[PDB]
Amino acid sequence: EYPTVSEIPVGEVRLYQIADGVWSHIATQSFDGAVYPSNGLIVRDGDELLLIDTAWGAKNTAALLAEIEKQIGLPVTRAVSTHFHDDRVGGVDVLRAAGVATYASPSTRRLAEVEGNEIPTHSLEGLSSSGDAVRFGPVELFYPGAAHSTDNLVVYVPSASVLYGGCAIYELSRTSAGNVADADLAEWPTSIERIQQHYPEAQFVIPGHGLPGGLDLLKHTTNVVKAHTNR
Ligand SMILES: C=CCCn1ccnc1C(=O)O
Ligand SMILES: [Zn+2]
Ligand SMILES: [Zn+2]
C-alpha cells in the first residue's frame, strides 16, 4: 500500500516498488505551516541507479540515499531534477557530496540560481521547446511546456509504462490548485494535452505529491487548473 503523509515523519523516506527496477521514493516536508508528502523516482540503470528528483531537502535526501543503499544496494550515479523548486533540487548539494552527478535543463538551472536554490551541475540538452524529448539511460525526458512551472519536465520509463508527471500532475484527491505562484495557468491545460498525446500507453502515472494513478490524473489535473482559472 502506498505510504501516506501521516505515516512518514519529516526526515524519513520510504521506497515503493512500482515495477521491476522502478521505485518511487516518498518523503515529507513542512511548507506554509503544514506537512506534505512528495514523490520522486528511482530507476535501475544497468548496474547503477538513476534518481529522479531529490527528497525535498538536505536531510531527507541523505535519508533517501541511506534507504536506497539499505534496500536496493546499487549506486546512485546520476540524478535529474524536473524543475527548480526545493522539492526537486533541495538536496542536490548532498547528492553531489555523495558522488552523484546531478542534472537539470538549462532553464531549471537558471531558475534555481535566480531563486537561490541548489543548482544541479550538468545541463540537459535538447529540451528547450515544448514537445522535445531525449533519452537518458533507461528513461525518456519530456518537456511538455509551461504548467506548474515554466521549466517542468516529465519522465517516462518505457520498460514498465511508468509516467512520472512531477508537480504538473495532481493526485486524484487534490481538488484545489493551491499554490501556483510560478505556474502558467493559461498553458497548463495545453501542456497536459501534449503529455497525453505523447504517452498514450502509460499504465502508471505518478504525481509530484500524493497517490499514483493512471491517465485519469491528467484529465483530473486540467479540471482543477481550469476550475481555478475561472475565479
Ligand atoms: C503539495 C502541495 C503544496 C504546495 N507544494 C509544496 C511543494 N510543492 C508543492 C506543489 O504544489 O507542487
Ligand atoms: Zn514545484
Ligand atoms: Zn511540488
- For 115, phi then psi, to 5°, come to -75, -10
CB 170 within 8 A of CB 217: yes
Determine the structural domain holding residue 161 and report its residue range: 1-231
Residue of the CA atom closest to atom 4 of ligand 1: 179
- For 213, phi then psi, to 5°, come to -155, -150
- CA 156/CA 154 separation, integer angstroms: 7
37 assigned to a ligand binding site: no
CB 168 within 8 A of CB 221: yes
* β-strands 133-136, 139-142 pairing: antiparallel
Most distant pair of Cα atoms in the chain: their distance: 50
- Give exposure, 14-27, as e/b (b: 16+ Cβ within 10 Å): bbbebeebbbbbbb
User: Among the atoms of ligand 1, which is closest to the Cα of residue 209?
Assistant: 1
Beta bridge partners of 208: none
Q: Computed over its alpha carbons, how large is the radius of gyration of the chain?
A: 16
65 CB burial (10 A radius; 0-12, 13-18, 19+) = buried
CA 211 from centroid of its chain's CA atoms: 13
- CA 45/CA 108 separation, integer angstroms: 23
Closest CA to 80 of 35, 31, 19, 124: 124
Can 87 be counted among the known catalytic residues? yes
CB 42 within 8 A of CB 22: yes
CB 206 within 8 A of CB 215: no
CB 2 within 8 A of CB 22: no
For residue 55 the three cell numbers come to 527528497
Ligand positioned closest to the Cα atom of 82: 2
Secondary structure E strands in the chain: 14-19, 22-31, 34-45, 48-52, 76-80, 101-104, 122-123, 133-136, 139-142, 154-157, 162-166, 204-207
Ligand positioned closest to the Cα atom of 178: 1
Residue of the CA atom closest to atom 11 of ligand 1: 179
Ligand 1 probe mutation, 167, 173, 180, most atoms within 8 A of CB = 167
**DSSP one-letter code for 83:** S
1 CB burial (10 A radius; 0-12, 13-18, 19+) = exposed
Q: At what angle do helices 188-198 and 216-230 cross, to 10 degrees?
A: 170
Alpha carbon of 126 to ligand 3 centroid (Å)? 24
* β-strands 34-45, 48-52 pairing: antiparallel
Residues 34, 38, 40: CA angle, nearest 5 degrees: 165
**DSSP one-letter code for 158:** G
| DSSP-H helix ranges across 72-139 | 86-89, 92-98, 106-115
CB 203 within 8 A of CB 162: yes
Can 86 be counted among the known catalytic residues? no
- Give exposure, 66-99, as e/b (b: 16+ Cβ within 10 Å): ebbeeebeeebbbbbbbbbbbbbbbbbebbbeee
Alpha carbon of 122 to ligand 2 centroid (Å)? 20
Closest CA to 27 of 58, 48, 71, 1: 58
Ligand 1 probe mutation, 179, 182, 188, most atoms within 8 A of CB = 179
How many separate domains does the chain show? 1
Residues 202, 197, 41: CA angle, nearest 5 degrees: 40
Residue of the CA atom closest to atom 8 of ligand 1: 87
